[PDB]
Amino acid sequence: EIVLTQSPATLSLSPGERATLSCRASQSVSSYLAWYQQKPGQAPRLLIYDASNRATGIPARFSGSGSGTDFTLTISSLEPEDFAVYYCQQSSNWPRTFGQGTKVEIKRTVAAPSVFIFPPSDEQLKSGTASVVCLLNNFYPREAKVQWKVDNALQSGNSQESVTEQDSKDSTYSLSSTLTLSKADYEKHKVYACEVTHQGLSSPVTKSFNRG
Amino acid sequence: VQLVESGGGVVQPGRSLRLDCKASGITFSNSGMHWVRQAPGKGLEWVAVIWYDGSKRYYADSVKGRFTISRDNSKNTLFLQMNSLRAEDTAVYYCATNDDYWGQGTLVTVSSASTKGPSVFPLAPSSSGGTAALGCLVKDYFPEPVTVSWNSGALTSGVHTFPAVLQSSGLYSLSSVVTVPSSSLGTQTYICNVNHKPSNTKVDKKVEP
Amino acid sequence: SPDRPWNPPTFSPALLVVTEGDNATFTCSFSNTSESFVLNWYRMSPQTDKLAAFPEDRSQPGQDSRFRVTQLPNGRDFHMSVVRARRNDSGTYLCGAISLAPKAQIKESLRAELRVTE
């Protein structure tokens, strides 16, 4: 299998700006590279095949280049429609291999998040389990770190994050990290703290509470 | 001018299943066909290909010996036989011609988990910046999806419903949160609305600080 | 060859000589029942230049025209015609067939030459 690496991971632009996306092969596919477009909850859309040739009924602003190993898809004047995830593909040999894809993200002003911490539902305990939720609403960019700290102590291997898709109007994300602990171990500690770090934060802020 | 797929949904491990892709308003019989899946939240992965007549076919290493790709050119139907399915094979399977006509995609979920209704737990609010945040936590249900409304769709501003994440139990869990003004807590009652249609479950939770 | 062998169109004559200001015509006979193909007319240079095509392209402005493509009644042969031929209209001409799939694949005939006297 050939390994297609796409760069960058995310691209933050605005309507009208240039867009250049790169794809690197573990090997040489010659010109057999293709480029696809995908929006959330949809099927892949062909854009450029054979690295130059543009798909039919595809806007002129879309183009491509590169040969052999490295190739570049380009969007001259970016459009609000064009914000999506872009994968390349090689038809050289088998198996046909895609890339991880590059995400073209809407670029906005930098807004720091809002940190909220929710103690385990009283009733959720009646079951024998506890879940702590650290909510982060309305921020940008997407980069965020959340360290769970119980009683000054370390912790990890527990939590799972989730982040909503980019807001339509606002253009910001939202993240919610959950911490699920046995009802027992939950009760044998004191403070539950959520430490968050964001490029909009002048200094990492930590929300917490006590079992009582 | 389409490709319509079929034969998806939930199946236990090791149990087989078979996809059907019926093309229309094209010439299927003379085009070549492909199979491409994608794991949820992850990129696309090529699966298999069959030449238009069937003279040759190639697979992905991940599917060898298990999957089988074929076509009946008479009925203009592409077939995919998926045998010995593993939980990892969970994906959305699209069919596409070599000339790149793609379908809607068909969803196949592989899990040993039974169909279970969600537990719904309240998330107590505030202590924020002038606004209060109150969520509801929908846990240990299967399979997806679950519709959530707040006060029967009568409150949408500040509503955020996070994508459900699959957890070590093999059961999904998510959190739906809404942002409201602090001072309003108690003049305006907040009730969460949970629906899981397959499990046939509807729950309304009254969230109070 | 996953898709399927699709054999290219043809052109005629190999060398066409018309007086200048006069009308020259080439005949492209292409037949496919299956799918949807669009015929294109070309002339090269020191390098494809698209002159006409069928169905007639209305997309770009520029009103009248010299180069035009039309299907004959038998529904196999097509008429490739430059009218009011200049002296610099001479050069390597050709035709090609094009599919309608997004990944559309093109095949061209064997190029022919035109000469304009006077």
Numbering used by the authors:
A (entry chain B): 1 to 212
B (entry chain A): 2 to 128, 132 to 213
C (entry chain Y): 27 to 72, 75 to 146
Original authors' sentences:
As the exact epitope and mechanism are crucial elements for antibody drugs, we report the crystal structures of checkpoint molecules in complex with the Fab fragments of therapeutic antibodies approved by the FDA or currently undergoing clinical trials, and reveal the binding modes of the complexes and the conformational changes induced by the antibody binding, thereby providing a structural basis of checkpoint blockade by monoclonal antibodies for the treatment of cancer. Monoclonal antibodies blocking immune checkpoints have demonstrated unprecedented therapeutic benefits in clinical trials and provided a major breakthrough in oncology.
The residues of nivolumab involved in the interaction with PD-1 are heavyG26, heavyI27, heavyN31 and heavyG33 of HCDR1; heavyV50, heavyW52 and heavyY53 of HCDR2; heavyN99, heavyD100, heavyD101 and heavyY102 of HCDR3; lightL46, lightA55 and lightT56 of LCDR2; and lightS91 of LCDR3. The electron density of the C′D loop in the complex structure of PD-1/nivolumab is also clearly shown, probably because of the crystal packing interaction despite the lack of interaction with nivolumab.
